[PDB]
Structure 1
Amino acid sequence: VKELLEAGVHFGHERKRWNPKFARYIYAERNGIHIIDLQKTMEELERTFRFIEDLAMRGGTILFVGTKKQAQDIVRMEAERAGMPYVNQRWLGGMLTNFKTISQRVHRLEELEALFASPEIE
């Protein structure tokens, strides 16, 4: 399943913009485009998903991030539909690094959520 699916319309990409390090994953270069190794991808998702899995069964919170347009909503949906945090909008200096301060804003959205639904606009 996870095999032929990806093997389908989901393989290879780009051309002449690449770290030679990522090259250990490329199978070939047909049509001038890098043909990523299909199999090598599956082999990886194995170790990955094992961590994805273990990480969830711990109850641990994953932060999703995809500011790129071709995935903006594709994050939104899947993260909400998982109770997990995500950011498809523009990222921010200190999201994690300067947490407490960025968080001050979250709290500010709580404060604003008060008056956004309270009889105090008399």
Structure 2
Amino acid sequence: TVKELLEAGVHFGHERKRWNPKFARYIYAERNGIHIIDLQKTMEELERTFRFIEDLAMRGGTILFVGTKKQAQDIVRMEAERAGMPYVNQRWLGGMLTNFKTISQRVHRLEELEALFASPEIEERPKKEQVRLKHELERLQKYLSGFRLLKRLPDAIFVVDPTKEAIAVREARKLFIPVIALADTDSDPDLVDYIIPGNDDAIRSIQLILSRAVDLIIQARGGVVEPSPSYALVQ
């Protein structure tokens, strides 16, 4: 909530190509063939976006975090592992929202296998199943790591790159789900309901935005939490 001047490394967009003309309103200028985001409109939209986040958080709503860009996976896997908003980390499975019932059946199988590895029934039905179900539970935890928390459809989604995660955006639009996204120059701003015009490639931009967002979430429900242990993920 105090990220006015601390925006170090967010204004750097993508190159001259691979952009989207609809983003021109959020662009300041072009330095050395690289689009640079307008600093003013960034906080201009941040006001409205963080205000919507605070409103939805103090109401007890759930926000799905979607990150697959390989530069925000390790960040989302813990910023959502904070206050219980679920997340999608490895890859976004087609139908996680429009076919939510079938994915919830997969989650039922996940907790079923977790219960079988808690009961003494691990030894019966010998080692063949003890390896098959082991690998099955392994991949179910790999893909449904954060998704297992969604009991019903979420009240909003948070995307790190709406171009890389366009399928999730489309599925949210189909179900009238508000779409919060950290957009860059390579994305269509019209599809995003609450835009955050920043950088999606750098690690510091994602860490800053998501840390401040989860901090605002916990602040909307009281009990301000310590600074997130995501700085060590700079490496």
Separation in 2 of the partners of 1:114 and 1:98? 25
Match of 2:29, SS state, is strand
User: Would the aligned equivalents of 1:11 and 1:38 in 2 still touch at CA under 8 Å?
Assistant: no
Separation in 1 of the partners of 2:85 and 2:61? 9
Write the deviation string for residues 57-84 of structure 1: whole angstroms up to 9, x where unpaired. Answer: 1100000001110000110110011111
Displacement of 1:8 in angstroms is 5.3
Whether 1:67 aligns to 2:44 is no
Q: Any unmatched runs of 5+ in structure 1?
A: none
Separation in 2 of the partners of 1:53 and 1:61? 12
User: Would the aligned equivalents of 1:66 and 1:88 in 2 still touch at CA under 8 Å?
Assistant: yes
Write the deviation string for residues 97-116 of structure 1: whole angstroms up to 9, x where unpaired. Answer: 10001110000011101111
- When the two structures are aligned, how many residues end up with a matched partner? 122
Write the deviation string for residues 16-38 of structure 1: whole angstroms up to 9, x where unpaired. Answer: 11111111100000011001101
User: Would the aligned equivalents of 2:11 and 2:36 in 1 still touch at CA under 8 Å?
Assistant: no
Displacement of 1:13 in angstroms is 3.4
Whether 1:47 aligns to 2:53 is no
Give the CA RMSD over aligned residues: 4.3
Displacement of 1:95 in angstroms is 0.6
The sequence identity of aligned pairs, in percent, is 99
CA pair 24-10 structure 1, distance change in 2 beyond 3 A? closer
Separation in 2 of the partners of 1:44 and 1:109? 39
Larger of the two Rg values belongs to structure: 1
Q: Any unmatched runs of 5+ in structure 2?
A: 123-234
Displacement of 1:120 in angstroms is 1.3
TM-score normalised by structure 1 residue count:
0.92
Separation in 2 of the partners of 1:10 and 1:64? 22
User: Would the aligned equivalents of 1:12 and 1:37 in 2 still touch at CA under 8 Å?
Assistant: no
TM-score normalised by structure 2 residue count:
0.49
User: Would the aligned equivalents of 2:65 and 2:76 in 1 still touch at CA under 8 Å?
Assistant: yes
Match of 2:48, SS state, is helix
